[PDB]
Design a protein that fits this description.
By secondary structure, this protein is an all-alpha fold. It contains 8 helices and no strands. The protein has helices spanning about 5-20, 20-35, 35-40, 50-55, 60-75, 85-95, 100-120, 125-150. Bound molecules: protoporphyrin IX containing MN. It catalyses: Fe(III)-heme b-[protein] + nitric oxide + H2O = Fe(II)-heme b-[protein] + nitrite + 2 H(+); H2O2 + AH2 = A + 2 H2O.
């Protein structure tokens, strides 16, 4: 798990995201969709988005970004004590949405990229290490639920 110091870094970085939840959420999703177009196909509501311009201009995409990062933020604030929060997400993403764990790897990488892009020189080596750990914990706990379900 993460140390106390590491959690404090994670939640410090998260303060940056909370100042513009929609903006961060939008850029995370755009980074995901442009970098991995197959991910767009998982969203009936975004598969019409043919271009990044269209993505950028989609208010519904920004809305979904807000939903996504709010759920993640709730999880992070549990500092690993997130069974109740993570379980339903694992379950909807395996059973309803059919999201392979690879796609969660993709979006983890996207969050790290977006943090550097929006805060260049203000996302330190230590902060990246701690946020990366937190994201991997999230992914790893989901992967455990995926194995339970025999998904992917
Ligand atoms: C590659 C695609 C997927 C990735 C990666 C992904 C990663 C993540 C993620 C990691 C940080 C968080 C947090 C996250 C959180 C959510 N997510 Mn998700 N998610 N996610 C979807 C695809 C994906 N998610 C699909 C598709 C829906 C249904 C969208 C709709 O039509 O409303 C969805 C829905 C949701 C919902 C709405 C409630 C529900 O359905 O469980 C939340 C909350």
């Amino acid at each position: 798990g993460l140390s106390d110091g590491e959690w404090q870094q994670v939640l410090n970085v998260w303060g940056k995201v909370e100042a513009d939840i929609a903006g961060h959420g939008q850029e995370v999703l755009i980074r995901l969709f442009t970098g991995h177009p197959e991910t767009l196909e998982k969203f009936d509501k975004f598969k019409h988005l043919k271009t990044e311009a269209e993505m950028k201009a989609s208010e519904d995409l920004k809305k979904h970004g807000t939903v996504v990062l709010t759920a993640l933020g709730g999880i992070l604030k549990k500092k690993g004590h997130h069974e109740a929060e993570l379980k339903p997400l694992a379950q909807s993403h395996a059973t309803k949405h059919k999201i392979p764990i690879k796609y969660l790897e993709f979006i983890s990488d996207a969050i790290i990229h977006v943090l550097h892009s929006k805060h260049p020189g203000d996302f330190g080596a230590d902060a990246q290490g701690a946020m990366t750990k937190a994201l991997e914990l999230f992914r790893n706990d989901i992967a455990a639920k995926y194995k339970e379900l025999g998904f992917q």
